């Protein structure tokens, strides 16, 4: 007989962050909205016709 055991394997496994996916509201934007209307439309020059 040959004594000294057979063989036994270690428990060890590789690791990864799985390309995981979540929500982001901030990622959906790069630009701001244009301004409101700064201009008068009511004014009249009061000509006596």
């Amino acid at each position: 007989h040959v004594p000294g055991g057979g063989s036994v394997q270690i428990v060890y496994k590789p690791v990864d962050l799985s390309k995981v996916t979540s929500k982001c509201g901030s990622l959906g934007n790069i630009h701001h909205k244009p301004g409101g209307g700064q201009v008068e439309v009511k004014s009249e020059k009061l000509d006596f016709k």
Partner: protein
């Protein structure tokens, strides 16, 4: 009271619970110094940053107690990217111990599936990335401004 340095992150917000003998104009000035005092930095998208409350009652005295009498007191509560240091620490510790599956069997004998533990890590991986998404200052100059790193 959590042992991560707050200067690593920037503040998403602060709440300050003030007690007892407090004059509001002293809270005003203080937070006006702190909101310009350069060691305290806030996220680019919370220029308001603050929540107060002012209570008339101080804390009280305790027999054989460990804290002493003050005319006024303050709890703060604070949220900041600084706490990601812990996410990174579970990310560290799991990648040490669970990579060799040590102690897993005690869980598996007790109504877990190894599939949940796997999920819960991925949610944690998503959460440090969700924390890293929010702390960053806002998209600016992209496409238009000259390079800064060489």
């Amino acid at each position: 009271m959590v042992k991560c340095d707050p200067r690593h992150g920037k503040y998403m917000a602060c709440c300050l619970l003030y007690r007892g003998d407090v004059v509001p104009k002293d809270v005003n000035a203080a937070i006006a110094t702190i909101k310009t005092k350069r060691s305290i930095q806030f996220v680019d998208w919370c220029p308001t940053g603050f929540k107060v409350g002012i209570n008339y009652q101080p804390p009280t005295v305790v027999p054989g107690g460990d804290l002493a009498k003050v005319q006024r007191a303050v709890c703060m509560l604070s949220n900041t990217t600084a706490i990601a240091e812990a996410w990174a620490r579970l990310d560290h510790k799991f990648d040490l111990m669970y990579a060799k599956r040590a102690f897993v069997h005690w869980y598996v004998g007790e109504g877990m599936e190894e599939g949940e533990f796997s999920e819960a890590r991925e949610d944690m991986a998503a959460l440090e990335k969700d924390y890293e998404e929010v702390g960053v200052d806002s998209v600016e100059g992209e496409g238009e401004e000259e390079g800064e790193e060489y």
